[PDB]
Amino acid sequence: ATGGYVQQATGQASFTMYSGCGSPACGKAASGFTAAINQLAFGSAPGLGAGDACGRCFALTGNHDPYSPNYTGPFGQTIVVKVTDLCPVQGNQEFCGQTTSNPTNQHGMPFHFDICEDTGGSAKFFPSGHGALTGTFTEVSCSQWSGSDGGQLWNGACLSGETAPNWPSTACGNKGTAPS
Ligand SMILES: CC(CCO)CCO
Ligand SMILES: CC(CCO)CCO
Ligand SMILES: CC(CCO)CCO
Numbered sequence: 001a002t003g004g005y006v007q008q009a010t011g012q013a014s015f016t017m018y019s020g021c022g023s024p025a026c027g028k029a030a031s032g033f034t035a036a037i038n039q040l041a042f043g044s045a046p047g048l049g050a051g052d053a054c055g056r057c058f059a060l061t062g063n064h065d066p067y068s069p070n071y072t073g074p075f076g077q078t079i080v081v082k083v084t085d086l087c088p089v090q091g092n093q094e095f096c097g098q099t100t101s102n103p104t105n106q107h108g109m110p111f112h113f114d115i116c117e118d119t120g121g122s123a124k125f126f127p128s129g130h131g132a133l134t135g136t137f138t139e140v141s142c143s144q145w146s147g148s149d150g151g152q153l154w155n156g157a158c159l160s161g162e163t164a165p166n167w168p169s170t171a172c173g174n175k176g177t178a179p180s
């Protein structure tokens with residue numbers, strides 16, 4: 001996409017969970033299930049505001065635990081998240097370190113979703129004892145996402161991706177150039 005960001009409507013991803021998504025990088029939280037997405041897909045860098053992932057909705061499905069490769073299941077449910085946040089390359093090499101010259105993380109995945117625990121998404125997705133998974137994502141209409149956006153936390157905050165057609169398309173827009 002513009003800026004060299006790797007923004008595809010469907011693909012393979014790794015998945016983790018995190019806490020404290022009330023002041024996320026897009027500048028609005030949301031009450032439904034939300035995620036951070038790796039920087040190369042988010043479309044911005046720390047401190048540069050919202051990227052084009054902001055507000056878009058994705059159906060996530062886990063089907064493997066890379067840390068327990070003999071575990072056969074069960075896995076969790078497929079969930080629909082809204083991207084509100086950035087999982088930056090900095091400090092997240094294992095999962096979110098994808099770049100334009102090296103587009104897969106340490107688990108071989110070209111995307112990562114860090115699912116926020118606070119609002120319930122991770123409890124639907126991760127079986128107890130299995131907090132890192134790999135699987136798939138597909139961008140869907142936000143008609144498929146329950147929830148309400150929070151208010152702007154700063155000028156320039158954006159979740160406009162929530163009404164956009166699936167990638168390829170532009171809503172909030174990408175900021176600068178993707179990490180090389
Ligand atoms: C759970 C929400 C309550 C306000 O709608 C806040 C999550 O950001
Ligand atoms: C995390 C669970 C799904 C939520 O109902 C895994 C099912 O065992
Ligand atoms: C809140 C659910 C929709 C109920 O109709 C979706 C999340 O599980």
Ligand SMILES: CC(CCO)CCO
Pocket residue numbers: 048175176177178
């Ligand atoms: C200077 C930045 C632009 C943010 O809109 C990043 C340059 O790559």
